[PDB]
């Protein structure tokens, strides 16, 4: 009898043209109800707790299972959890999952890579103040017109950010680093010396 308030609350957001998903306007309302910027990290966290497949929509099962898992039948209970969830992102292993989730969440379904502009936007979001070289990294990619970002390069950039020194000296010129990261270093090394 707990699903009662939850089913009703789902009906608030469901796409009129598809009962099995929360659509564009529904996502806009859901965010509006939470008093959050749709594009905020806080919304991203919620989707990550929902285990959402693709940005800008939730399946009827993504919403119900997710809210159920957090034990929330309202939008205030959800809000009350935000910080406890946002803090949840201190754990290194928990943040990695979130970070890697961001890739598959952000990209188009059925395509292997992530478009550059979306990747930058999502990097700014998740990796802001985690990465000393973010600004230079995005610029690097924009200037050379790499149109797409592979999963391998996305996932490993995290590890790169964790271990790279202010002067990049500890970076081994051999490495097991994906080409794109290595190119960045060979570009970025002069700019810091």
């Amino acid at each position: 009898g707990s699903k009662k308030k939850l089913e009703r609350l789902y009906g608030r957001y469901k796409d009129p043209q598809d009962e099995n998903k929360i659509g564009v306007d529904g996502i806009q309302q859901f965010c509006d109800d939470l008093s959050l910027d749709p594009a905020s990290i806080s919304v991203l966290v919620i989707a990550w707790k929902f285990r959402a497949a693709t940005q800008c929509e939730f399946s009827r099962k993504e919403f119900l299972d997710g809210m159920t898992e957090l034990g929330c039948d309202s939008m205030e209970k959800l809000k009350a959890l935000l910080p406890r969830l946002e803090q949840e992102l201190k754990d290194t292993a928990k943040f990695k999952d979130f970070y890697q989730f961001t890739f598959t969440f952000a990209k188009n379904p059925g395509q292997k890579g992530l478009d550059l502009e979306m990747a930058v936007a999502y990097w700014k979001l998740v990796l802001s103040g985690r990465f000393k070289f973010l600004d230079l990294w995005n610029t690097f990619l924009m200037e050379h017109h790499k149109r797409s970002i592979p999963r391998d390069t996305w996932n490993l950039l995290l590890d790169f950010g964790n271990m790279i020194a202010d002067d990049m000296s500890n970076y081994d010129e051999e490495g097991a680093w994906p080409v794109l990261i290595d190119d960045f270093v060979e570009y970025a090394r002069p700019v810091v010396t």
Partner: peptide, 11 residues
């Protein structure tokens, strides 16, 4: 939901 603005202006 970065793409939500573009997807609203497109629908």
């Amino acid at each position: 939901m970065i793409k939500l603005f573009s997807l609203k202006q497109q629908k």
